[PDB]
């Protein structure tokens, strides 16, 4: 079993990184194009990023829910900048309108400059104390309880969400974080622990630690991984596409991004930037794992590059560690959603092996362009 | 010079108040029905309420924006439970996706229990201090400024909204409130001051008060009024429908509703609850002004009742006081939106006079159901 | 079993017949309103009329299919004015796009003036000869057969529809007609025989006649009835609403309508026109069967008028005769669709009994408008 | 000025011709993707093919109209298989539902086998006599006339289209045909004369003939061209992409299509098949004009292949001949719609030079994926 996600580029899209050449603006029509493509191609869901660099995740997810049928939306909540009772009501409303298609990504926010801009002057350990108290109120409120809670940071009295969610006990909690406090938080409250595309050896160590701490609370959590993907029919086309993706990036842009990454107080972000060292050489840190994206883009900075057989093999290596969720992305996000679904889906377990080419449809007849007006293609 | 709004019943709908008989569940489909009706009928916009008793306003409005073309959405924000910078990004995104169809209703929250349920333990004077600092940050960030602010309650450092809104300088701010702190805040920062359906005499005093305080800041504030409406072809049918609206309300529900109203420290709620005092008699506090709605429903608790000429007469009276915005509602909200547009619109100024019956359309030809198969109606 | 249909007023809508007072123009917005209401309220489908007085059924049905989830569309085909091979491809495409939600209403056309306007100069028997040959090509082509056909009226060689339909062997064939040629055609080729709202005794004879002729061919056809419905909470309101429907109808308009009906060459139209005799008196030709609609409207000219228990009883009577399909309509079509579902559905067999009031939804919680802000309705 | 159309692959889509490898089935979701992409990218419209090899044009176009805002639809009508009065009502309905976004492609049918399959046993000259009589009735009824027409093939009495279209006097008539009868028909009745992708010298002779024949009637006929496009950043990429397109085409499939084209009774099809005569070598019949598509595809069988400067240059060569409309297509039709708009639109006249990259968008701010979370791309 495997859940394959796509990605909504709410922070912008294009053919090349760190530039405006071939860039596509974030519009409702284009986001609808990507979401409906992922919905019809059979992706389990789409991840919506959050932060100052992105449009609001909740406005986007809510606008695309009535325009899609089965696609699930992994939406980020940010404790510390919103009341947990209100956030719970937001999740309840969106889960009700979507008929149980809401997934929650718990985000603590690793940029102190962004946090101060939102009015949150908490330290790294305080952000996780807030998130811990946030989730405890959030989870109980969505289970129908009038909550009285008085913590170090948050205090509510008679917190109630009158409209229950569709998913019981609440929309599943996804969480990504690499710090010690992050692993304690995931082990206690979250349902799925997420990691960025570190090499398999590093991901194995992070999974073993989360599984160990989850055993102390008598819990078993699931695991997912966030990776870019540059797959082509051959590996030579894939590496050429990987090279062209960062060819228009000047050293003034690389050094500016790494300088902004040094300001971040995020254990996961530092581990990602440490893979490429801010240089253009040795970007293939592992077989078919390419760290060129991290030179400019924050967060996910690695990509699987190669033919379909190679990309599938690297997906199996991660799956052998206990990873069941895979959140992929490509540039541009519309075309690469079709590319990954056509090249990689037939090599993945069901239902993705059967969803390839056809998609979510039951139609037959002339499959492909008709030869003249009386010859079926073969 | 008139904008006519309708209302999305995100707190529940039905044919009768208090009871569940004839109640209509609020789903995505039914909200699409109401929103698309007001859009096609030519209403300027719809009001979406906020609170523990309602679904989330932002999730609802975002879900209905891609499903309408011209309809504006008056969406409520509540300072004190969400970061002002994050709220500005939410407003920017929705205003961009809707192409400038977003309107903001500033809500301070008049129920101390609901405020404590969300984590806010502020007094009446402190809630307006937070809103005042909230709006100052909110209005400046949406204008492209990197804001440094340090007030009594809020503190931001390098607050920025990277995606500018469509409406300049920002989506217009609507505000309702009758306390002295409310009128000072309305005079300084809001664009439209809203009032509930009080008799014209009391509305004129509140309007004259806000208008004078706003003059000290050099601002010309617009005025709107929130009112229920029960309009029928004759005045006799209207009073029958008003009686049926409350015929299934027991005295134990009235006491439970008024017991909650006394908990509210809201000045506007106190003035509305004092018009009926829980009585079932003397509900016509003014010519064609019926206060039966306020027996169980908080907020707007008065209604215009009568034939189209009587309802339009009360509307012109309010308009002669300087009121340019009108937010109406009826039970059930779908049918009454058509009834009001078909009975009252032809009696209102343009464009509502021309929008009567036809609506926002350019189609010609047979008007009405055809006679036989070749005889046009006349 | 029981399938309950609604009706799309593609020939115009309104509150009153004959006149233009309270008329609603047929627009894409309003047809979306009616279709999406019937879809969400749980109706099995909607009937779309065809003819000179209506917008094209195939364009309307195709435009609303992507905007609805489970609603079926009973679309009309008229042999003699379109190639059966092309019509077969149209049915295949719409059935494929709707994922098997297409239903076919075979219409022979009962107005010689309209038929001549379309280029058809066939007599009554010749129209049924064309229809009989049409359906044979239509059914064989949709079953994947390369058809050579040389009949009296139609001639095709190597007729093929390369895209098969979702429903096998083809979308079901509904047919309405009262002539002897109609009963032969229905007994031999159609799946469901439809009749207008005649008294149960007259319906029983037509049903027995069709059933006997189908037995001779070794076939069993189902039966449905087409009726208007004016249902109110009490019987007195229903009869008052029936009087309002024809209060704005002048005798000059009745005479012009009945003069056009005498031009028609349809047995079913004459049987319907013979129920009211072109007069306003004795319109209740049967218990709760009111023939006032036929005084101006062509086709369905009777209505079920009464309280829910009275309407549900007349439905049960028809169902005792073997009728399993019920195609209802009301004025206006949007509001009356909710009225019938909220009043009659609880008195109908499953699933209409469980779909009553709530529609097709899995939402729980506060049912009805909230009392104050923490008191659930009861 | 210039109108740039795209193409809906209602006959099938994919990456490679002649084979099922990489093929995409014609589904509602995929067609919605292609149409909404062309709508948002700024294309003037899309062409929808008709015939036995495709899904029905009217069903497809009607289903996509409510899902698009500005995109126009060039929909085919085929005289001889449908009544002109019925066809005019379909055009009136779709033009009204789309608010004037309907265009008509007049198709006579060049395949005798496909025509006989639809019940039309007319010769080449007879098909143009039917079309001439069809269009006279079609154009007159849409102008609000009760038409009496008695011709050699068609006879109508009191033909009326009750619902007038939005476009006056009627939706524009596009027409393609290279025979002498076609050029007479285009000079007299049609608004836009279309030609397939012949070399510029052969196009100039056809346009000069039509212009001369139309001047005798005092009419000016707009000119358009239909062409596939394989454009890439470099010329070598485009030529390699063109080779990949036909690399899976078996020589037995080429002969299976050329023998099918010999049966056709179309002068324009013969002129297209005479450009290569099945020869696999030297398919570049003109600078950047590649006839590789004509090996297996009927109708349009030539493509523009080259870098953006070469493709734009060939477009300007056709424009100087007087061609104002361009109907382009590519494989696959979704990805190639973006490729052409992003690569060729900036080299085209307004408004396509402004629609490049930006598209129909008034949004400002970040343009492309954000560098980190505060640095905008440049
Ligand atoms: C898969 C994944 C997705 C994430 N998405 C976001 C996001 O959208 N916005 C964000 O600010 N942080 C995101 N993060 C990062 C964390 O949620 C959080 O901001 C912080 O970096 C965790 O800090 P830590 O590694 O020091 O424990 C994501 C992390 C992962 C692994
Ligand atoms: C037109 C209008 C709409 C309002 N909408 C809301 C709402 O949706 N939620 C809410 O809590 N309060 C709403 N209020 C009430 C005030 O915004 C605020 O909550 C408080 O009651 C004002 O307190 P005050 O009158 O003492 O200054 C509304 C008021 C008006 C006039
Ligand atoms: C339920 C029902 C629906 C019908 N719908 C249509 C229609 O939409 N357009 C139409 O022209 N005739 C319609 N008819 C009438 C017949 O299909 C046909 O046109 C003709 O009147 C039958 O003639 P006959 O009774 O003499 O056999 C309908 C009949 C029934 C019973
Ligand atoms: C741009 C263009 C589009 C056409 N589209 C179609 C079509 O969709 N279906 C079709 O059968 N023929 C199509 N044709 C061909 C003609 O409409 C017609 O079928 C026939 O080939 C003309 O015959 P002629 O060249 O001998 O005058 C098209 C022609 C052109 C130039
Ligand atoms: Na390193």
Numbering used by the authors:
A (entry chain A), B (entry chain B), C (entry chain C), D (entry chain D): 0 to 377
Q: What did the article's authors report about this structure?
A:
The 2.4-Å resolution crystal structure of MsuD in complex with FMN and MS− (ternary-MsuD) was obtained by cocrystallization with greater than 5-fold molar excess of both ligands. Ternary-MsuD crystallized in the space group P61 with four MsuD chains per asymmetric unit, arranged as a dimer-of-dimers. Of interest, residues in all chains within IS-4 (between α7a and β7a) and from L354 to the C terminus lack any electron density, preventing their modeling and resulting in a very open structure. In each chain of ternary-MsuD, α7b and α7c from IS-4, as well as the protein C terminus of an adjacent chain, are ordered and observed to enclose the C-face of the (β/α)8 barrel, covering FMN and MS− and blocking solvent access to the active site. When both the lid and C terminus are ordered and bound in ternary-MsuD, the active site appears completely enclosed from bulk solvent. To our surprise, the dataset of ternary-MsuD contained contiguous electron density for residues A355-A377 of the C terminus. The C terminus includes two short helices, a 310 helix from F344-L347 and an α-helix from Y351-A355, followed by a long meandering loop that extends from each protein molecule, inserting itself within the active site of the adjacent molecule at the tetramer interface. The binding mode of MS− positions its oxygen atoms within an extensive hydrogen-bonding network with the guanidiniums of R296 and R225, the indole NH of W195, and the backbone NH of S299, resulting in placement of the methyl group 3.4 and 3.9 Å from the N5 and C4a atoms of FMN (respective average distances for the tetramer), whereas the sulfur is approximately 4.4 Å away from the N5. Therefore, the observed binding mode supports the methyl of MS− as the site of oxygenation, and the closer distance to the N5 of FMN is consistent with use of an N5-peroxyflavin intermediate. The third residue, E368, extends directly into the active site and is positioned to interact with Y330 and R296. We also cannot rule out that ordering of the lid and C terminus within an entire tetramer may be perturbed by the crystal lattice, which would explain why cocrystallization of ternary-MsuD yielded a tetramer with four ordered lids and four ordered C termini.
